[PDB]
Copies of this chain bind each other. A is one copy, B any other.
Amino acid sequence: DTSSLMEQILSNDNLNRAYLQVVRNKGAEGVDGMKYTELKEYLAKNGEIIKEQLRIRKYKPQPVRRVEIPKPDGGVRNLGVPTVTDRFIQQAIAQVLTPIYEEQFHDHSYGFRPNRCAQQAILTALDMMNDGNDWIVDIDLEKFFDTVNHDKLMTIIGRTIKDGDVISIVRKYLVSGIMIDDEYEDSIVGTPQGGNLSPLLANIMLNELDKEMEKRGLNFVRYADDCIIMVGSEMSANRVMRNISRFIEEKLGLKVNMTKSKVDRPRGIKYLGFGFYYDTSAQQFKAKPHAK
């Protein structure tokens, strides 16, 4: 029964934990200019007003603040920073939804999940490669929150979450522009900015991909919207590339960049900041940070 989750989200126990986490996470200000050091006093004054607005679906998230971060290669990393109030509410929601979805998620999904990290994905993939599955299908997706259809995503979420008050606020956060901090691509470890709820939502939809791959008996790892599939031959890899790309676009409504997607051997793959090499003493593929 998921029809009455809002009061769990709004319980004093859950909100106190969310507050403490958000202040621990610090982070830049959102569009309202409020610093994380101001949240305590703000909630002392306005917390009951905010809870009331959420209960009646009259709370309006602020748009995320768009920040551009220079990349080492001359590109730009885009971040969407929620206000600290919205980080708090997002964290409160995620604390309740995370345990629900942890029961559904696949063991080879590693991104933005409790006690999981990029290095675990790498080690799982290496074990598959060293078992002979060293033709890699590297499907490149356009940014999840730039391309996902909100109606499709909310429909998937609603298969589990029956509480319409929670559905309503989650949709409003999609509209506000929440997104995935991709600094892990540069081998960075640490708290993502603006990531209390968006990565979970992406994992809910991409769990459908995990289930399709599992139905096909495929060897894969996934970290948010970045998946690699380990296959035993070039011919099979090309078939997998075609079949899974079609599934992603047709069933999930996401966009595959076919130019950036490729079939290659491990030495050609860059994944989660790592490259791969064959250790000729161990007789094993291994991984290490790729040049940036």
Contacts and interface: CB of A to CB of B under 8 A. Distances in A.
Contact of A72 (B26, B189, B288): B288
Interface in A261-292: 273-274, 277, 279, 281-289
A165 interface: no
A266 to B, nearest CB: 11
Given A123-B117, A127-B24, A193 B274 contact: no
Interface in A171-188: 183, 186-188
Contact of A284 (B26, B69, B115, B131): B26
A207 interface: no
Given A24-B130, A120-B117, A190 B72 contact: no
A119 interface: yes
A81 B57 CA distance: 65
A161 interface: no
B119 A118 contact: yes
A4 to B, nearest CB: 32
A92 to B, nearest CB: 19
Contact of A282 (B190, B282, B288): B190
Contact of A188 (B26, B67, B283, B286): B286
A122 to B, nearest CB: 5
A289 B286 CA distance: 16
A193 B281 contact: yes
Contacts of A28: 281-283
Interface residues of A, number: 42
A28 B26 CA distance: 48
A292 to B, nearest CB: 8
A281 B67 contact: yes
A186 B120 contact: no
Contact of A279 (B190, B274, B284, B287): B190
B122 A286 contact: no
Given A117-B119, A120-B115, A285 B190 contact: yes
A191 B287 contact: no
A123 B28 CA distance: 20
Contacts of A273: 289
Contacts of A120: 115, 117, 119
A282 B119 contact: no
A194 to B, nearest CB: 10
A98 interface: no
Contacts of A289: 187, 273, 289
Given A28-B282, A193-B281, 8 more contacts: A26-B283, A28-B281, A72-B288, A117-B117, A117-B123, A186-B288, A188-B288, A189-B274
6 contacts: A24-B127, A27-B282, A187-B288, A191-B282, A193-B281, A193-B282
